[PDB]
Amino acid sequence: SQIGLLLPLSGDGQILGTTIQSGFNDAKGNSTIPVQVFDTSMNSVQDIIAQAKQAGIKTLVGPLLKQNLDVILADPAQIQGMDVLALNATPNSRAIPQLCYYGLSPEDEAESAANKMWNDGVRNPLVAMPQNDLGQRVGNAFNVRWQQLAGTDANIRYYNLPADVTYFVQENNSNTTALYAVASPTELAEMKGYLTNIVPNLAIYASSRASASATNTNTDFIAQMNGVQFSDIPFFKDTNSPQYQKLAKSTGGEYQLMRLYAMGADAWLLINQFNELRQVPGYRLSGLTGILSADTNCNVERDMTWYQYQDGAIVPVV
């Protein structure tokens, strides 16, 4: 009947919220469902939920920022009687009825990498995570999936400097055949250049963090990265259309903003199928940000698309 959209639309987070909102609104199109917008930078989450309720709103999309979600997680009773698609997640959170979580998380991408590598015949992968909390969380996501596929733990290591990854290879037996690395584009390029002298035929897999506008339009970078495969959203498969070109112009070519646009679009898709997502086992939706499904805690997971640097171009993997 009515939706409340909770996003940061001013202050810190404004570019995130306004870009998600654009995707959401473009997806919504000519919908007759009214959407009331609540700027989470100008009111507390608690007060917004009270406003929404008193307006007769029973369905929310958002909030986005971790600190905002923290409020709901600290007092989930305030959303009783509502359907809420939060736009954030935590690798280890609880089940709350009528709450689902939709983050574009790097954990999603790690799980996809485990699946991909396993299907490609990789065994004993080296998994190189940054030595920080995020690296720990993403590595754990990889490991849990690998345990399911392979029946054994993954070799998770934590780098401080890109050269550490070559140490990891040298410290292991002679049978490291593939690497999953989470790193910036240049870091990944630094890593790969060191590994050339050590394991020049290493199969390298990376996340979407390795794919950025500035480096992907650099010929030398693309050459350095030849053979590297990485995950990203399926939105980037076909970039020729006027609609894609117009979005690329509006975002200054920034992939991170286009991913947020796509997230908003998929939030519209998901909120309209909220009950189905919760109730139908093995439910899947084809979205701009991946093939979407829900785990037991109604955390939305994403099946990623794979891309590869190949002879001067970036091409979807067949």
Q: How far apart are CA 304 and CA 101, in angstroms?
A: 17
What Cα–Cα distance (Å) separates residue 102 from each residue in 123, 186, 218, 221? 31, 29, 33, 33
- In angstroms and rounded to an integer, the radius of gyration of the C-alpha atoms of the chain is 21
Give the closest residue to 9 by CA, choosing from 54, 65, 58, 81. Answer: 65
Element (H, E) at 310: strand 305-310
CA atoms within 13 A on the CB side of 292: 29
- Domain annotation for the chain: domains and CATH numbers: 1-104+233-305 (3.40.50.2300), 105-232+306-318 (3.40.50.2300)
Q: Please report where in the chains the tokens 């404004």 appear, as a residue.
A: 14
Q: Please report where in the chains the tokens 């590297």 appear, as a residue.
A: 228
Give the closest residue to 68 by CA, choosing from 50, 91, 48. Answer: 48
Question: Are the CB atoms for 127 and 155 separated by under 8 Å?
Answer: yes
Q: How far apart are CA 316 and CA 77, in angstroms?
A: 45
Q: Please report where in the chains the tokens 């990891």 appear, as a residue.
A: 168
Question: Are the CB atoms for 142 and 194 separated by under 8 Å?
Answer: no
> Angle of helix 66-74 relative to helix 45-54, nearest 10 degrees?
70
Question: Are the CB atoms for 2 and 33 separated by under 8 Å?
Answer: yes
Question: Are the CB atoms for 87 and 64 separated by under 8 Å?
Answer: yes
User: Where does residue 279 fall: left (phi above 0), alpha (psi -120 to 50 degrees), or beta otherwise?
Assistant: alpha
Element (H, E) at 286: strand 285-287
Q: Which amino acid is at 43?
A: N
Q: How far apart are CA 101 and CA 85, in angstroms?
A: 6
